[PDB]
Design an enzyme around this catalytic site. Structure first.
Site, short mmCIF file in Angstrom:
data_model
loop_
_atom_site.label_atom_id
_atom_site.label_comp_id
_atom_site.label_asym_id
_atom_site.label_seq_id
_atom_site.Cartn_x
_atom_site.Cartn_y
_atom_site.Cartn_z
N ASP A 1 5.70 -10.97 -0.86
CA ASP A 1 5.87 -12.19 -1.63
C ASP A 1 4.50 -12.75 -2.06
O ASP A 1 4.33 -13.96 -2.19
CB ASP A 1 6.71 -13.21 -0.82
CG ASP A 1 7.16 -14.42 -1.65
OD1 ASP A 1 7.25 -15.51 -1.04
OD2 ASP A 1 7.47 -14.34 -2.89
N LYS B 1 2.31 -10.65 -7.76
CA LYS B 1 3.30 -9.65 -8.18
C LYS B 1 2.71 -8.28 -8.59
O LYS B 1 3.34 -7.22 -8.39
CB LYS B 1 4.20 -10.23 -9.28
CG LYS B 1 4.92 -11.56 -8.93
CD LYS B 1 5.54 -11.63 -7.49
CE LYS B 1 5.52 -13.08 -6.99
NZ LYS B 1 5.74 -13.23 -5.51
C1 LIG Z 1 4.42 -17.05 -3.39
S1 LIG Z 1 3.21 -17.72 -2.19
C2 LIG Z 1 3.96 -17.15 -0.65
C3 LIG Z 1 5.15 -18.01 -0.25
C4 LIG Z 1 5.69 -17.63 1.13
N1 LIG Z 1 6.07 -16.20 1.16
C5 LIG Z 1 6.90 -18.52 1.42
O1 LIG Z 1 8.02 -18.09 1.12
O2 LIG Z 1 6.78 -19.65 1.89
C6 LIG Z 1 2.03 -16.36 -2.45
C7 LIG Z 1 0.80 -16.43 -1.57
O3 LIG Z 1 0.18 -15.16 -1.50
C8 LIG Z 1 -1.21 -15.32 -1.36
N2 LIG Z 1 -1.74 -14.08 -1.88
C9 LIG Z 1 -1.76 -13.66 -3.20
N3 LIG Z 1 -2.28 -12.42 -3.20
C10 LIG Z 1 -2.59 -12.03 -1.94
C11 LIG Z 1 -3.13 -10.87 -1.40
N4 LIG Z 1 -3.51 -9.83 -2.17
N5 LIG Z 1 -3.30 -10.80 -0.04
C12 LIG Z 1 -2.95 -11.86 0.79
N6 LIG Z 1 -2.41 -13.00 0.24
C13 LIG Z 1 -2.24 -13.07 -1.09
C14 LIG Z 1 -1.52 -16.54 -2.22
O4 LIG Z 1 -2.71 -17.11 -1.77
C15 LIG Z 1 -0.27 -17.42 -2.02
O5 LIG Z 1 -0.46 -18.35 -0.97
O1 LIG Z 2 2.40 -15.21 -7.74
C1 LIG Z 2 3.41 -15.92 -7.89
C2 LIG Z 2 3.55 -16.74 -9.01
C3 LIG Z 2 4.69 -17.52 -9.20
C4 LIG Z 2 4.75 -18.40 -10.42
C5 LIG Z 2 4.50 -17.90 -11.70
C6 LIG Z 2 4.54 -18.76 -12.80
C7 LIG Z 2 4.82 -20.13 -12.63
C8 LIG Z 2 5.07 -20.64 -11.35
C9 LIG Z 2 5.01 -19.77 -10.25
C10 LIG Z 2 5.75 -17.48 -8.15
C11 LIG Z 2 6.95 -18.21 -8.21
C12 LIG Z 2 7.93 -18.12 -7.21
C13 LIG Z 2 7.77 -17.30 -6.08
O2 LIG Z 2 8.72 -17.20 -5.11
C14 LIG Z 2 6.54 -16.48 -5.93
O3 LIG Z 2 6.37 -15.69 -4.83
C15 LIG Z 2 5.52 -16.57 -6.99
O4 LIG Z 2 4.36 -15.84 -6.91
MG LIG Z 3 8.56 -15.65 -3.96
#
Ligand SMILES: C[S@@+](CC[C@H](N)C(=O)[O-])C[C@H]1O[C@@H](n2cnc3c(N)ncnc32)[C@H](O)[C@@H]1O
Ligand SMILES: O=c1cc(-c2ccccc2)c2ccc(O)c(O)c2o1
Ligand SMILES: [Mg+2]
Length: 212
Positions: free
Chosen positions: A139, A142
């Protein structure tokens, strides 16, 4: 004051400490009634509960912790001695996630790895005593789903029956990962349709089960 520490404060003000379910529900209402955040959310949350109950994994890897919502969601359902490892690259986020886990009572189940998954995955066996993972929640960013999956396979972290479970497979989308996992005979896939968090746009989780 930051959106995330705004959420952490709401939880500490509204949830019953040591109660995971309560913490979840504070996060969900905060994000439904005031500010949208990118937590997996309750609707896909329920799907995840179901999958974890089914597999009861001893060792789970989360890619992307954020404020801790999905880590709390999963760790609350782990059996005694089961372990969650969660990778988060943003230290402000990894700090909130710690405070969130702490509040929920789950800190003995969950280890935060501060860093970027591409760097941390190869350090998993050496520094964290991991043989193979039973389940992986994807998560994070992407564009990282496929490369990190190929990297997990490379470092020997996947086992026949390991479950990969992927959020956001439709929105924002992870086309290359989906194409790769569906097309590959080394992954058995099922799609679980749902709706984006806090907004009824059609998203889904892909479960992809490693075949060897
Ligand atoms: C969509 S939020 C995660 C939400 C969490 N899974 C939840 O459901 O509460 C994505 C997070 O991934 C972290 N992130 C993005 N790329 C990453 C990477 N390559 N390695 C570790 N963390 C990463 C970002 O800093 C962000 O906090
Ligand atoms: O990197 C993203 C970026 C988005 C994101 C992309 C465009 C606008 C807002 C959020 C994101 C959204 C919902 C979600 O469950 C995720 O894990 C997401 O991760
Ligand atoms: Mg998500």
């Amino acid at each position: 004051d930051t959106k995330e520490q705004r959420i952490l404060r709401y939880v500490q003000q509204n949830a019953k400490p040591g109660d995971p379910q309560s913490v979840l529900e504070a996060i969900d209402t905060y994000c439904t009634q005031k500010e949208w955040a990118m937590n997996v959310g309750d609707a896909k949350g329920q799907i995840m509960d179901a999958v974890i109950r089914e597999y009861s994994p001893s060792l789970v890897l989360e890619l992307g912790a954020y404020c801790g919502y999905s880590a709390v969601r999963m760790a609350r359902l782990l059996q005694p001695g089961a372990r969650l490892l969660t990778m988060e690259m943003n230290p402000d986020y990894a700090a909130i996630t710690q405070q969130m886990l702490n509040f929920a009572g789950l800190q003995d189940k969950v280890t935060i790895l501060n860093g970027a998954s591409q760097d941390l995955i190869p350090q998993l066996k050496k520094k964290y005593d991991v043989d193979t993972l039973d389940m992986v929640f994807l998560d994070h960013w992407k564009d990282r789903y496929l490369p990190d999956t190929l990297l997990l396979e490379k470092c020997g972290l996947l086992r026949k029956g390991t479950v990969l479970l992927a959020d956001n497979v439709i929105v924002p989308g992870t086309p290359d990962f989906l194409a790769y996992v569906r097309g590959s005979s080394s992954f058995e896939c099922t799609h679980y349709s749902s709706y984006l968090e806090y907004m009824k746009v059609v998203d889904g989780l892909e479960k992809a089960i490693y075949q060897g």
